[PDB]
Structures are given as C-alpha cells and as structure tokens.
Amino acid sequence: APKVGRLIYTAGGYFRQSLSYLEAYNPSDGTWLRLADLQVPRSGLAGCVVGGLLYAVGGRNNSPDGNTDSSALDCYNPMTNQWSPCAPMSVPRNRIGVGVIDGHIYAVGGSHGCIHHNSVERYEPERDEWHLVAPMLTRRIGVGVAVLNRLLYAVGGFDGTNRLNSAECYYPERNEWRMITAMNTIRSGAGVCVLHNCIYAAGGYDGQDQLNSVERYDVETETWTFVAPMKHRRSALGITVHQGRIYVLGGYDGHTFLDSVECYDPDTDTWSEVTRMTSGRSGVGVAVTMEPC
C-alpha cells in the first residue's frame, strides 16, 4: 500500500479572504512546493484523489466583491501542474465533506446561504457526471467525511441550530443512511479521516470553543474512544493520512489562523509538530497523491 513520491496537497483556505493556494508538503524532506493556483479562490472546500488526480470540491469564495458559494469541481493533474474544470454539482456546497468509493466522489452536505444541506451526490469521472443519491438523515454543514471498507461516514457538523455529536453511515448497495453511535463530543468543523479500522474525529467546534480532543470510532465495536489530544485546539482544519499517520493542517482556534501541522502516531499515541504551513489559514482541502513533475 505505501509508495514513494507521495505529497500532502493543501488547496484553498481562508485568511481575511478566500485563498487560491495549492501547496504540497513532502514529509520525507520537510519541504513545501508552490503549485498552480486555483482558478477561483475557495474556502470551506474539500479535497480528494481519484486515479492520481486531485479534485477540489465545493467551498465558497469570500472576497470583498461578495460571497459566492461554490458548486464547482476542479481537477489538478500533477503530471501537468494544471487545473481543469469538471462538471459542477447540482447545488453550491460550502463547508462540504467528500469521500471516494470505487473511484466515485461523494459530495456530502454543506451550506448554500442559510440553507443547510442533507443532500448527497456522486460524481463519475469516466462520464463527467454528477447524480443525486439518498440524502442524509441529518442536515450537516462543516461535516467530516471518511470512507472505510467501502462505506461512507458523515460525522458531526452543524444543522443550522445546534452543533452535532451525531454521525451516520451510507451503505451504497442499499442507497441508505443509518445513524451510528454518537461521538462523545459535539464537533463542528472537525478533521475526519480513516486510519486502520477506525474513523478519527480531531478537533472541531462545539458552539463555544475549539477543541484539541481527538476520538476514534471502531467500526467493529461501534464505540468512540478518546486518543491523545492535539497540542493545538483547532476547527475548520485540514486532515489526511500518510504512511500510517494522521496529519492535521491549519485551522482556527477562535483567536488565530493556525499554520501548525501536527502528526499523530497511532503506535505511540502521540502528536508531534512536524512543520508549519507557509501562512496560517483555515478551511483548506487536503489530499495525498504523487509528486508533480
């Protein structure tokens, strides 16, 4: 499963305005690479990879000229260092979560103005088409999404009135969502990822404060268990998994836009500061794929 030449890509983000940055971090030598800007600045987007290509999904362009929620899907090829537009989603989705199953991109929840989506849609890259699938049981913006064992999980978020500790799972062969065990902590804008047989939820916002606590859901035992907390509390953070470790990137702690990048080692149950982003930002999209040419 592991292979050389893989980088952690971070796309977009927010700092006083939505950002167009695409930067790639190499954990092997600690270097950052500046790559082609997004065609449209976006915060609150999600990133994912299908067939070696990096996709930026949804978000919102917060600029002095206005605030525009994004239905866009854009594809970055590391072999060419170029972005290419894809077919747009059916609705704009800010503060979105995405997950990949069998080479298809699931776009989950998000906001459009004061509308809080429970709708979900699926992208087919070979046909460049989006199609709606079953909506979630709960409206969720700032939702964390991860895929384990070809099942799609939507974790936490904000429904328009309350931040959520609830979570649910999508079963594709049934086109059906079912609630799973609720988290021990209310988390909106948490970083959600998959490591081994567990869904991790790191950080987030409970309506009052940002969190440094981290918990993981064992899909076999159906229980949430806290692991070691991050050094820096954060919400609207980027997250990914690389070489069996969790990386959290940036975010907002209620006072400062973080440039901190922490790395979680599950064998030692410890977090370590590995690098800092070139500038503090929140609401990034993050994914791992091969290094560019």
Ligand SMILES: Cc1ccc([C@@H](NC(=O)Cc2ccc3c(c2)CCCC3)[C@@H](C)C(=O)O)cc1
């Ligand atoms: C991407 C994302 C996901 C979830 C959220 C959720 N809020 C937070 O985490 C608090 C937060 C986070 C970043 C920033 C601010 C506030 C205010 C200043 C600008 C940056 C949102 C749904 C909610 O619970 O109100 C925000 C953004």
